[PDB]
Each structure stands twice: as C-alpha cells, then as structure tokens.
C-alpha cells in the first residue's frame, strides 16, 4: 500500500489496455489532470485523478453527482459545461474521465500580455457564461458553482471562442453551507466575506469580476487577504448598504458603525482611494478609447458598447444578492443585442 496519496503515472504508460497516458495538464490541491488517448473510443481524455484522501474523495463524489445530474437534461445550455464521459477506480484512486478541452481565459489573457481581449470577444464569453449560469439556476439543479475564475474556464479549440466551465469540486446546492470559505479572494462576493447567506447570485458576482479582467488584462479586485479584498471593493463600489452591513455577522472586520448610525471602514492599525471613487467607468476607459486608450481607432469599442458593457457589469457587482442581476435577465440585456 502505497505511504503517499498521489498515483504514481508514468508518462507513455497504458491503463486498462484503453488509456495512453501522453502527459501531466495540471496537479492541484485534489490530484492531478493527465491527458491520455482513448484507444477504444480514439479521442483525447483528460483524466482527473483523485488523491487517496476521505476530503478529496468526498469533493469528487459531490462533483460526480452533480456532472451526473446535470447530464440528464436535454438543453444546449448544458454544453457550457465540461462532460464527464466516465469514472472508474483505478489503483485504489477515483478517475474522472472528461472530454479534453483547450487552454484557460487566464493562459488567454497572458497570451495578450495582459492588455485583455476585445469587447467583441468579452461579449461571447459573457454571454456563454450567462447562458451556463441559466442552466445551473434550473430548479432541479439549484448549484452553486462557488469558484469561477479564469483558470476554470476553458477554450474547447484554441481558435475559437467557445468555452466550458471546469472544476465542481467545491460546488454545492442552494440552501447548503459546506465548507468554511468559499471562492477564489479575488473572486469572492461581499455576502460570502461578510458570511452572510449565499445563493446563485455568488457566481454572477465572479462573472462580473471575471468578465472586466478579461477586457483590461488585470483583476478588478486583486486583495492579498480578504480585509484588502474588502477595501479593493470598497474603492468602486462604496461603503455596502446599511440594511446588509446591520444584519452581516462579519460587518466589523471590515466596517464600524458611528454614532448616528452611518457605517464607515474600519479604522487600520497604522492608504485606500476614497470610497466609491475608483470609478468602473474610469477602469474601463469607456470615454476615453478603452483600456488604456488602446481600443481608440479599433472597431467594436464605441462609447455606445462601452456604456452597455459597464452597466452590465454594475448590475453583476449589486451588492444586494437579491436585486443583483440574474443570468435570466442578463440575457436580455442591450449588451447582447
Ligand atoms: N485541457 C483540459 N481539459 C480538461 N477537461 C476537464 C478538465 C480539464 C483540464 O483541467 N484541462
């Protein structure tokens, strides 16, 4: 019996008299991502090889469920998510075998130095991933994918501009609360860093950051912990509303309430924009030729696309979960027309 968790996987070896393995994609916190060749089915997999660990086992058991679950379904919104072809034990590890797709947005961005991706190609993928983000509301599904970021979601063909989400390792339903923190930090919603309740609406406020980062190159909200993660957000968007920051169990790790009942930041230990004053319209460039200036004299960058882009993306960092945009109603906006 092997001391470690990990699968040792020989690059060239053969599994099963089916899988070639060719090479390592990715090792995470989970196991590790090879990309094989299915001799029976001749395509390319990548296999996600779970390490033998109750946690990592149990996160894969809650994520084949979920693949499962949302496979029965007819719709073409379920093409937006990554297909689990198979699972299988295999040297005492669980493997989940996916269709094999391209590189990631964050592999995409530094491909663009970091200068970002046209609106045009913003808007596909925003667009794709409202759509996905539809089919996960879907009642019987009801999941929360609680990690988008960049890095989970991927090209299908690295000329084209379709994509998939990856990775429902740390996912779960409406209404469950599994895991102490939840989403990457610069990724992460104000109700889950306030810990308040989450529902869908974390994963449209990824969308929002995620989408912005695509266009100028750079995170919207780059904290190095989460007290400067609040700040970073602060310096947009303002101080929260007082009906979330009176009934938030963490208001007072990033706020204090005065005397007349106004909440302001809290004081530091002893550097910030003022609140609300780092203006998206002013990241964006939407005056002003984009990021940058470097959209001026490109088509598909007007003001008109502009203003559209920014108050969409507004919607999407509503700190009020509740009225915050939905992908239904995101759908229909003029950005998409
Ligand atoms: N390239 C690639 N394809 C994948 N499909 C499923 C996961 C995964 C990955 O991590 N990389």
């Known amino acids: 019996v092997p001391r470690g968790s990990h699968m040792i996987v020989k690059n060239g070896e053969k599994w099963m008299d089916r ?72 040297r005492n590890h669980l493997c989940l075998v996916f ?27 925003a ?45 779960c339903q409406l209404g469950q609360r599994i895991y102490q923190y939840i989403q990457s930090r610069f990724y992460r919603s104000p109700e889950v860093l306030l810990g308040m309740p989450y529902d869908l609406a974390i994963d449209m406020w990824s969308l929002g950051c995620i989408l912005v980062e695509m266009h100028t190159g750079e995170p919207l909200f780059s904290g190095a912990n989460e007290v400067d993660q609040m700040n970073k957000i602060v310096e947009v968007l303002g101080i929260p509303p007082a009906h979330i920051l009176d009934q938030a169990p963490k208001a007072r790790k990033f706020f204090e309430k005065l005397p007349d009942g106004t909440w302001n930041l809290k004081k530091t230990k002893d550097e910030y924009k003022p609140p609300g004053t780092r203006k998206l319209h002013n990241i964006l460039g939407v005056e002003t030729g984009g990021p940058g200036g470097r959209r001026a004299g490109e088509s598909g ?37």
């Open 19 to 90: 899988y070639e393995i060719d090479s390592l994609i990715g090792k995470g916190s989970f196991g590790q991502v090879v990309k094989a060749y299915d001799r029976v089915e001749q395509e390319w997999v990548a296999i996600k090889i779970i390490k033998n660990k109750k946690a990592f086992l149990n996160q894969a058991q809650i994520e084949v469920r979920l693949l499962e679950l949302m496979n029965k379904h007819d719709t073409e919104m379920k093409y937006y998510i990554v297909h689990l072809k198979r699972h299988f034990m295999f």
């Open 99 to 125: 269709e094999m797709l391209s590189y990631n947005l964050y592999d995409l961005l530094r491909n663009t130095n970091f200068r970002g991706v046209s609106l045009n190609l913003t808007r596909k993928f």
């Open 127 to 171: 667009q794709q991933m409202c759509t996905a983000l539809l089919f996960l509301a879907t009642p019987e599904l009801s999941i929360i994918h609680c990690d988008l970021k960049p890095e989970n979601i991927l090209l299908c063909n690295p000329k084209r501009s379709a994509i998939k989400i990856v990775d429902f390792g740390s996912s």
């Open 301 to 337: 960058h007007t003001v008109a696309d502009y203003l559209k882009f920014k108050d969409l993306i507004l919607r999407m960092l509503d700190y009020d979960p509740k009225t915050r945009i939905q992908p239904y109603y995101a759908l229909q906006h003029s950005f998409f027309a």
